[PDB]
Amino acid sequence: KYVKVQDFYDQLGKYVLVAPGKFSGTVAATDLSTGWTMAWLAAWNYGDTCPIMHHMAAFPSPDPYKEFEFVVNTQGGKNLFIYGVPVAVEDPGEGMKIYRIKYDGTRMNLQRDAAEVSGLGLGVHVTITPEADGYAVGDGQKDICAEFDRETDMVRYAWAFDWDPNVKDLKRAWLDGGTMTIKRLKPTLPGGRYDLQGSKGNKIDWELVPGGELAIEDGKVSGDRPLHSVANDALVFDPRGKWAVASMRLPGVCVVFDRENQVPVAVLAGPKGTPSQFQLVKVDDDTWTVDIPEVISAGHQAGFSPDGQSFLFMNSLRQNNIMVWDSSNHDDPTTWEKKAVVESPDWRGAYPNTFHMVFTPDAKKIYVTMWWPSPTPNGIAVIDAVNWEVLKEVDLGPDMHTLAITYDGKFVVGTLSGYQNTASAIVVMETETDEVLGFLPSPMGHHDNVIVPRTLEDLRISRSTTT
Amino acid sequence: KYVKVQDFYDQLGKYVLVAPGKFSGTVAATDLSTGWTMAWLAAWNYGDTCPIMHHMAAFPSPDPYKEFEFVVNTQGGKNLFIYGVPVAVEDPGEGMKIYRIKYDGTRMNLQRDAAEVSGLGLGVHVTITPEADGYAVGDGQKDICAEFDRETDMVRYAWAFDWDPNVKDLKRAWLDGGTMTIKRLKPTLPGGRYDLQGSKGNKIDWELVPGGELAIEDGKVSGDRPLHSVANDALVFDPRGKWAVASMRLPGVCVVFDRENQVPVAVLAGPKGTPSQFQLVKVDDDTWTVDIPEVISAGHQAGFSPDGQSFLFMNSLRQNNIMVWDSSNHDDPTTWEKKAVVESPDWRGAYPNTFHMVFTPDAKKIYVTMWWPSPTPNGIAVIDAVNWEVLKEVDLGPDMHTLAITYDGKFVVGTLSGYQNTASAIVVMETETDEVLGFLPSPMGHHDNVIVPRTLEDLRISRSTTT
Numbered sequence: 001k002y003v004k005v006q007d008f009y010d011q012l013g014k015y016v017l018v019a020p021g022k023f024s025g026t027v028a029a030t031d032l033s034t035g036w037t038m039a040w041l042a043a044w045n046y047g048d049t050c051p052i053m054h055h056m057a058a059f060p061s062p063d064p065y066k067e068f069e070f071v072v073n074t075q076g077g078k079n080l081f082i083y084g085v086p087v088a089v090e091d092p093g094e095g096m097k098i099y100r101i102k103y104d105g106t107r108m109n110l111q112r113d114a115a116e117v118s119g120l121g122l123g124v125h126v127t128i129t130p131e132a133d134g135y136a137v138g139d140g141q142k143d144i145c146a147e148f149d150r151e152t153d154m155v156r157y158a159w160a161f162d163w164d165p166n167v168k169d170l171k172r173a174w175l176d177g178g179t180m181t182i183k184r185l186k187p188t189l190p191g192g193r194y195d196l197q198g199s200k201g202n203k204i205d206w207e208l209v210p211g212g213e214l215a216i217e218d219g220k221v222s223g224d225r226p227l228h229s230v231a232n233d234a235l236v237f238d239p240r241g242k243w244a245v246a247s248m249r250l251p252g253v254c255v256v257f258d259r260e261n262q263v264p265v266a267v268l269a270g271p272k273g274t275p276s277q278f279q280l281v282k283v284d285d286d287t288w289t290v291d292i293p294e295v296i297s298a299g300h301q302a303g304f305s306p307d308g309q310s311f312l313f314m315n316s317l318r319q320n321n322i323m324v325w326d327s328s329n330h331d332d333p334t335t336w337e338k339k340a341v342v343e344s345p346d347w348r349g350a351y352p353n354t355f356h357m358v359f360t361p362d363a364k365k366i367y368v369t370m371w372w373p374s375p376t377p378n379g380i381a382v383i384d385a386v387n388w389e390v391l392k393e394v395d396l397g398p399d400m401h402t403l404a405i406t407y408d409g410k411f412v413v414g415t416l417s418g419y420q421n422t423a424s425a426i427v428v429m430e431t432e433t434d435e436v437l438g439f440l441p442s443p444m445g446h447h448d449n450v451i452v453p454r455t456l457e458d459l460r461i462s463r464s465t466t467t
Numbered sequence: 468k469y470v471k472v473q474d475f476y477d478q479l480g481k482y483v484l485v486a487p488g489k490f491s492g493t494v495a496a497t498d499l500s501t502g503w504t505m506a507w508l509a510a511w512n513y514g515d516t517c518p519i520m521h522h523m524a525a526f527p528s529p530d531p532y533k534e535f536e537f538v539v540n541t542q543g544g545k546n547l548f549i550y551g552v553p554v555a556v557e558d559p560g561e562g563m564k565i566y567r568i569k570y571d572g573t574r575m576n577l578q579r580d581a582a583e584v585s586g587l588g589l590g591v592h593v594t595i596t597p598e599a600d601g602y603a604v605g606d607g608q609k610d611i612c613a614e615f616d617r618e619t620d621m622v623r624y625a626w627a628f629d630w631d632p633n634v635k636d637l638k639r640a641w642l643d644g645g646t647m648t649i650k651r652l653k654p655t656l657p658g659g660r661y662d663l664q665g666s667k668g669n670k671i672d673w674e675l676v677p678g679g680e681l682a683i684e685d686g687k688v689s690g691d692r693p694l695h696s697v698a699n700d701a702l703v704f705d706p707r708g709k710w711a712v713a714s715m716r717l718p719g720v721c722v723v724f725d726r727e728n729q730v731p732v733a734v735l736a737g738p739k740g741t742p743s744q745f746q747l748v749k750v751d752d753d754t755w756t757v758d759i760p761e762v763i764s765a766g767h768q769a770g771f772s773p774d775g776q777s778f779l780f781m782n783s784l785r786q787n788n789i790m791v792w793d794s795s796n797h798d799d800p801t802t803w804e805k806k807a808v809v810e811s812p813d814w815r816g817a818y819p820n821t822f823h824m825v826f827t828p829d830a831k832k833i834y835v836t837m838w839w840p841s842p843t844p845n846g847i848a849v850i851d852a853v854n855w856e857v858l859k860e861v862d863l864g865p866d867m868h869t870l871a872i873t874y875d876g877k878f879v880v881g882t883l884s885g886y887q888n889t890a891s892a893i894v895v896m897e898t899e900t901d902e903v904l905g906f907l908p909s910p911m912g913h914h915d916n917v918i919v920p921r922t923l924e925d926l927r928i929s930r931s932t933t934t
């Protein structure tokens with residue numbers, strides 16, 4: 001007549017949860033079928049002076065418990081001053097590192113820093129290619145994103161984004177529109193290397209915090225080049241191959257990239273009432289532009305349903321909803337048209353924001369995150385992806401972040417992360433009747449979490465297609 | 468249809484688990500009633516450049532949820548280089564910090580490094596005074612131990628310990644016997660502060676490891692003064708006041724000291740084939756010696772029964788046993804006589820060593836760890852503490868560390884630490900029928916944990932009386 005916590009985990013199946021801990025310094029693999037941490041890694045170990053450990057993604061493995069590979073980045077610079085911790089390192093390391101890490105069935109071995117190898121340092125999202133032959137990072141202080149080869153860790157293409165405001169005052173620089181340029185970067189050092197590790201190429205001094213467009217507008221984000229920010233956040237991929245979509249927060253657009261031919265081919269328009277798309281203009285071999293008349297809202301979260309037949313981009317703060325296109329046509333992104341929009345009283349005021357999402361395998365539902373600043377209950381809301389409405393919402397706790405799903409599609413498993421100073425959990429939730437089965441210790445402030453995929457098809461619902 | 472983990476947690480009651488994480492750099496507090504981490508702190512945030520977060524202890528709090536205080540201490544220097552981990556840090560800091568931290572019902576808040584206050588820095592067990600008006604810290608590098616004020620963090624009294632060996636050859640220097648000095652240690656800088664923060668005082672470059680007496684003997688441990696080493700481990704407290712007892716690892720003894728009178732009063736003799744005690748000789752007002760014919764076996768873990776009717780000391784490596792004294796005469800420690808010796812047929816090898824214990828509140832059972840070098844499964848033995856015999860041994864998995872108990876007596880709560888590169892976990896066993904209830908994620912490397920106690924009474928079974 002005593003309850004064994006093992007009974008809990010029995011129901012979860014043979015999956016491996018991984019997560020980085022932001023100010024914690026750590027990355028951690030957990031075995032849901034038992035409750036142990038398989039392994040963990042403290043990057044201070046490795047002389048890293050600002051081991052803000054940030055986004056990660058993992059390669060599909062035939063047996064994750066035997067071995068698997070992952071990628072996880074870091075932030076530095078004025079990133080350390082932007083949470084509520086009264087940190088003491090006045091002058092931190094710059095981060096912007098792209099670690100390569102293998103769990104080999106025992107432990108995690110630090111393989112290298114990919115930004116030393118390539119010479120390109122990025123510190124926001126990391127995704128895996130749908131072929132698992134590579135991976136991608138985005139970045140929001142230097143506004144560059146990049147697809148990298150898995151073996152060589154060299155950049156396959158990088159794309160810089162620059163904002164030229166119609167009205168040259170922070171106060172109107174986005175609202176009153178302008179023109180963004182899409183700039184094909186090229187190595188500048190010998191052996192195909194870039195010169196962009198670290199705070200090198202930062203337009204601003206931290207990635208924007210949520211509703212941070214208000215902040216930079218008000219002159220409150222230090223950097224050399226803020227009038228020039230577009231704030232890239234991600235680079236995600238088409239389950240079907242060929243395409244990748246770069247996400248730009250502040251001009252609320254997404255730009256569709258021909259990966260093999262390395263060219264941009266469409267710019268998807270975020271805010272409800274806009275067209276489907278803005279017009280891509282080519283200046284030369286390495287420079288396109290887009291004309292944005294005004295910026296009604298900033299965007300954040302972007303990605304594809306698992307069969308790629310639907311593209312999503314979330315409007316946040318000024319508007320709060322899910323903007324949705326028909327990406328059905330795989331041969332031609334310029335034809336992707338607005339298909340629906342998901343609104344709800346759930347999105348009450350400026351907050352909550354919806355920054356993260358995972359689908360079900362069967363592209364019928366999505367679980368999406370609800371973020372408030374403290375103390376407002378953060379939670380999950382569940383999306384009917386066939387009719388496009390909110391089914392329900394569940395309150396959970398402080399500072400919701402990412403979500404992942406078991407590959408059998410059974411349990412959702414997210415990380416709540418105490419605003420880097422308070423309560424942090426793993427949350428489990430069953431897809432069947434959308435009940436919160438409850439929480440597991442997690443003394444880390446996760447901005448990322450995945451479950452190790454086995455198959456290429458598993459990826460389609462992992463950090464590849466969404467963030 | 469689905470199992471909720473909250474059913475599991477509902478049975479444990481309202482206790483807070485607190486734990487440091489070693490090479491993790493972090494300390495975590497965990498709500499056993501809900502599964503959440505209440506708050507965590509990453510020392511690197513506070514300019515700690517070798518945050519090996521070691522021992523800790525927690526002050527009684529009327530309501531832990533609302534607020535509580537702890538002591539947690541770091542190690543440094545070549546302690547970095549000791550484990551599986553291919554650490555890469557050019558300039559480790561020295562460790563030896565004694566941090567004060569304060570959970571305010573939402574976050575932890577670093578209040579002070581006390582060794583900067585006192586100027587004495589010690590890196591091995593933390594204990595809480597039985598009156599909860601103070602703490603004590605031991606160290607086996609400097610071989611100092613000291614009690615501190617809670618309010619001032621200033622040293623009440625401090626003792627230092629020197630080996631003068633019979634045979635001046637490292638290999639023979641404990642086994643053929645020797646004389647141990649016990650000195651009053653007295654401060655050197657203005658405002659009665661000590662000149663002994665960080666590495667100053669280190670006679671060896673790291674805390675010996677399990678088996679570590681073979682390394683020291685073997686010339687394998689560096690430092691200025693190995694022949695002089697006694698490796699003080701802890702300064703643990705008589706739950707009934709007056710005494711504290713200083714565990715000495717290489718001389719296989721425990722020293723018993725009058726707290727308010729700062730003299731030693733008794734040397735207890737650890738191994739099988741020794742008297743209950745050896746002779747104290749006063750050399751002068753500040754100093755004392757004891758002659759030990761030969762060190763039959765090194766010892767380690769040591770403390771009292773909750774009613775301190777019993778005092779205990781483990782033989783480790785050369786013997787593996789639990790030596791028990793009749794400490795019932797609280798009047799006069801030199802009256803204390805060995806009464807029982809707990810042994811079992813599977814303690815006959817070098818391994819496993821028993822370094823930690825917890826007692827049930829009524830005193831009739833102990834819980835004790837079974838540590839091994841990988842890959843052999845570490846464990847918990849249950850000790851009948853009226854008959855003094857082994858009751859049950861349970862396999863658990865790698866690198867068992869410390870144990871604490873719920874104060875209602877029903878759940879034992881332990882830590883496994885994956886030798887700092889593999890599996891780590893919190894473990895819960897129930898004390899009714901000594902079944903293992905299972906495991907919780909603990910991505911850290913705990914060599915300590917506590918349940919926040921609520922009365923001076925709970926302290927008799929916490930990080931006060933045992934380690």
Ligand SMILES: [Cu+2]
Pocket residue numbers: 125233234300301355467
């Ligand atoms: Cu994002």
Ligand SMILES: [Cu+2]
Pocket residue numbers: 054447
């Ligand atoms: Cu982040």
Ligand SMILES: [Cu+2]
Pocket residue numbers: 592700701767768822934
């Ligand atoms: Cu010890």
Ligand SMILES: [Cu+2]
Pocket residue numbers: 521914
């Ligand atoms: Cu330790």
